[PDB]
Amino acid sequence: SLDSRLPAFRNLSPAARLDHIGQLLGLSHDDVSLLANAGALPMDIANGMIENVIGTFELPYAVASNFQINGRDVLVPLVVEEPSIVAAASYMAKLARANGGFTTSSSAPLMHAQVQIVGIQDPLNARLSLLRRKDEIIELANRKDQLLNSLGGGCRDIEVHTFADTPRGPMLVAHLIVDVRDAMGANTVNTMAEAVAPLMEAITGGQVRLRILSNLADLRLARAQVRITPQQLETAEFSGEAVIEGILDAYAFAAVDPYRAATHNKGIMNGIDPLIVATGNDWRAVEAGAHAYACRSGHYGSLTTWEKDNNGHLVGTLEMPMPVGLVGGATKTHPLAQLSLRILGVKTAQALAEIAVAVGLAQNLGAMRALATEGIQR
Amino acid sequence: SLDSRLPAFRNLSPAARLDHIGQLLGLSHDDVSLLANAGALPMDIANGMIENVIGTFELPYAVASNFQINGRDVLVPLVVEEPSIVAAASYMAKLARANGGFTTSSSAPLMHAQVQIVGIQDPLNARLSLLRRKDEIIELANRKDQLLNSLGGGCRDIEVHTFADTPRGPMLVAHLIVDVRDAMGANTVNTMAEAVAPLMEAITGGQVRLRILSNLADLRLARAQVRITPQQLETAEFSGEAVIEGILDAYAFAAVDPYRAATHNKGIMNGIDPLIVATGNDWRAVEAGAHAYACRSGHYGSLTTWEKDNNGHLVGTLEMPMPVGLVGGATKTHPLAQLSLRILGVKTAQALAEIAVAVGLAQNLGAMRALATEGIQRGHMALHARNIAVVAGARGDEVDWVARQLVEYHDVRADRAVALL
Ligand SMILES: CC(C)(COP(=O)(O)OP(=O)(O)OC[C@H]1O[C@@H](n2cnc3c(N)ncnc32)[C@H](O)[C@@H]1OP(=O)(O)O)[C@@H](O)C(=O)NCCC(=O)NCCS
Ligand SMILES: NC(=O)c1ccc[n+]([C@@H]2O[C@H](COP(=O)([O-])OP(=O)(O)OC[C@H]3O[C@@H](n4cnc5c(N)ncnc54)[C@H](O)[C@@H]3O)[C@@H](O)[C@H]2O)c1
Ligand SMILES: C[C@@](O)(CCO)CC(=O)[O-]
Ligand SMILES: C[C@@](O)(CCO)CC(=O)[O-]
Helix, strand or coil: CCCCCCCCHHHCCHHHHHHHHHHHHCCCHHHHHHHHCCCCCCHHHHHHHCCCEEEEEEEEEEEECCCEECCEECCEEEECCCCCHHHHHHHHHHHHHCCCCEEEEECCCEEEEEEEEECCCCHHHHHHHHHHCHHHHHHHHHCCCHHHHHCCCEEEEEEEEEECCCCCCCEEEEEEEEECCCECCHHHHHHHHHHHHHHHHHHHCCEEEEEEECCCCCCCEEEEEEEECHHHHCCCCCCHHHHHHHHHHHHHHHHHCHHHHHHHHHHHHHHHHHHHHHCCCCHHHHHHHHHHHHCCCCCCCCCEEEEECCCCCEEEEEEEECCCCCECCCCCCCHHHHHHHHHHCCCCHHHHHHHHHHHHHHHHHHHHHHHHHCCCCC | CCCCCCCCHHHCCHHHHHHHHHHHHCCCHHHHHCCCCCCCCCHHHHHHHCCCEEEEEEEEEEEECCCEECCEECCEEEECCCCCHHHHHHHHHHHHHCCCCEEEEECCCEEEEEEEEECCCCHHHHHHHHHHCHHHHHHHHHHCCHHHHHCCCEEEEEEEEEECCCCCCCEEEEEEEEECCCECCHHHHHHHHHHHHHHHHHHHCCEEEEEEECCCCCCCEEEEEEEECHHHHCCCCCCHHHHHHHHHHHHHHHHHCHHHHHHHHHHHHHHHHHHHHHCCCCHHHHHHHHHHHCCCCCCCCCCEEEEECCCCCEEEEEEEECCCCCECCHHHHCHHHHHHHHHHCCCCHHHHHHHHHHHHHHHHHHHHHHHCCCCCHHHHHHHCHHHHHHHCCCCCCCHHHHHHHHHHCCCCCHHHHHHHC
16 A cells, blocks of 8 residues: 655655654564664674775665566665665656556575586586486585475476587586575575585596586566657657657667667666665676676677667567575665665565566666756757 | 773773774764764755755764774774674684785776767767867866866776667767866766867867766776684684685675675675764765676676685785765765764875775675675674574564574574564
């Protein structure tokens, strides 16, 4: 029943904003006081989180309004230093509301862990010997996380890739494919990969080197859609139809020119990374998966798509890797990460991922709209 | 001058760490007070930085030790949530010190402003019309920012690219090449792009669309070098020669497989982004420039290089775009961004950019050395043992006792903190 529209929110005091947020969600007094006074992350907690700590560092904590995800209103916390991001997110979310809001979907929460093996005289043969015994390897990985498996996750499969031409000789690389449920999953699959490497070595006869997740998490994709009508985009100087054509022009620019794509995709992360930070997740992992995926073709291109549908409406998509957690890393440890998660209402990590790509799509739309409607000076 | 070794820093309390830092830099009591107390970012400043603000959000603020840049010791502040990063960077700086530390340099701080032109049937011809009048275009860009020119910057050149066959028809893109001095550059070059847009329209007869910086800042490069000897890399299990070979195996793996390079480059930005955050700079811009640069060849690869020199020593490089500012929005506004700059001692944006690539190179070395020896999990999971305790159902204050036990048994897993609980 949540209403995320938040009229005049942009003009209230932070206290009145905090007040209003707590009314809508039924936030407890303990929850509200986490943001009412500075220092919600005690030094006892901060000193255990990273090394050589001498203090804490604040960034603003904001809430984007209007977002609606498969028909459900959602409030979006965001932590960033740069102006205009929150406004643009909120305004595009407001336009998206009229045409159904954002529509999202996602894959299962699957992470790859790589096991690199050098020194094999017959790596292509060894690959088949490895695959043939994958159940044994899968069983071995799952012994190290009885908890994960009890919750419906765990190692599901193995794939093997080979690299014949390398300055350091031929390389075999096994991928454990692991359902990590509500975790982002890095430590989980790293333990699994370290655990299975000796059996793998025994089968293939090489020497194991790296045992490590891949951040190109292309089995953990999240998807968002948005639709905008010409009427919604009409400005003083341009018809709504001309604005749509200009947005498509800017999109094709990003699609052919990496100099533009880098900036175009930067605007997307302007919307995603602040949500990642606000929920205590690793934003370097999200950035690396985002940009590596944008050039999987060998050409660094745009993560979003923008089209005109058969009705003349502007339709955008965002599909990308989105590894995030509700548990693990620092997401349980930072009190405000827990509060961010309560504000969002998410019950699985994949639901958080779908919100992330919705916000990234909205940020890109706001960026391109502003750039396309800016008249030429004279 | 300054000594960045910080003996026993890892085991001092945050307050005693801060006192030692204060002593070393001659910080004032007011300066030290900004980290000895919560809320250095006042709400009225936070509320004016971004929209819909309802509070602030803290991340830990740390200092990495041992770093040395071109013979000078430097203290490096870092803001991040993930354990092991700061320790690995300090460790690798420690090793680098024995062989001269990090050697760095950087190019002039040049950014591209893009001006996209559509609506012409002759973009190839129009490109030559622009190049013919480039001095008139550069001169008009430079009256728009006369202060910047007195500071030693400004528009130096233009280049012009064509994409004559795109789905939306032909398309011409002019790049202004702008020296932005000590700014990241976005607003400087964006203004200049707007200024030249009607003149380019008149020259080409097309319609200008986007006027915007590029974050693929490949004319704003920073460079770091490091050297490590085999004796420094020996462990009880492994010869230092074997570790160096294992590191080269790891590097060749990143060079051929994008599934590996993504993670490899991620480990570099574990080092760089927290320094960007600590100085109030835009970390999305640095990430976009970094990863897009890693694919410029048409294959997504490693930002660092690792080799064995003729003495058998491990030598590493990092050259990448590094657009950062000492001025510009959050950097002057956030009191702790100003303190970070004071701790760093940097006098130009390029000095800061060179520290960033030194840290990123050190970070990448730290991950690879762990990966090529005992595995990432041993040292990292030990420092992660409190989060594993909290996750497995501790929190409260039994966090210290089960995290202690997890580290004694060298088995930091949720399964183990559960059964210990
Ligand atoms: C984490 C790691 C530093 C543990 O150190 P170790 O192997 O047990 O070695 P040592 O205890 O001898 O420490 C050597 C140096 O590392 C640094 N260091 C190690 N642990 C540290 C800690 N808790 N805090 C601060 N600095 C630390 C120090 O500079 C130390 O020097 P010192 O002898 O003056 O104290 C090491 O395993 C590593 O570098 N792992 C890679 C971690 C990584 O890459 N993380 C990215 C995120 S996974
Ligand atoms: N290159 C990288 O991205 C990289 C590499 C190494 C480490 N890391 C770090 O790893 C950390 C995240 O690792 P993680 O996600 O495995 O967290 P974690 O290791 O802290 O916790 C994962 C464990 O939580 C348990 N768990 C409890 N409830 C669960 C639930 N509902 N769903 C799934 N698991 C549950 C599981 O037993 C799991 O093994 C981040 O701090 C990240 O920065 C990242
Ligand atoms: C405006 C933009 O550069 C974000 C600025 O931080 C994104 C874009 O150009 O698409
Ligand atoms: C350890 C690493 O994954 C960073 C962890 O955040 C980097 C790497 O694999 O090189």
